[PDB]
Amino acid sequence: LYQGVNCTEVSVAIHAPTWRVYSTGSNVFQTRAGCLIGAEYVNNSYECDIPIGAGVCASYQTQASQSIIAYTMSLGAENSVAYS
């Protein structure tokens, strides 16, 4: 996570230039905490495993393609009480 950056400035500087020289290519994605490169965003929702910020968590989950997925957290299950 490059914290505090638009995902279109780590691309147009990775094409030198950025400090940390070591590079990486996988799946850029803009969160409200920064740019996550290396993790795919699902649309499902699960409990928090590794916090990242602003509602987003990450985890190593099979797909047995095992990779690091990113998702928005679930605050719990649903339940309506039969009030009459």
């Binding site: 914290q3 505090g4 409200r32 905490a33 916090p51 910020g53 602003a54 509602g55 957290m73 605050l75 719990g76 009480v81 009030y83």
Partner: peptide
Amino acid sequence: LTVLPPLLTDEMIAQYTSALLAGTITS
């Protein structure tokens, strides 16, 4: 100097306050 964002958005802190006010009126 950088300010970092809170992990529970202001709409997730309001969805927990709605489950507490709706379990006290119903149960």
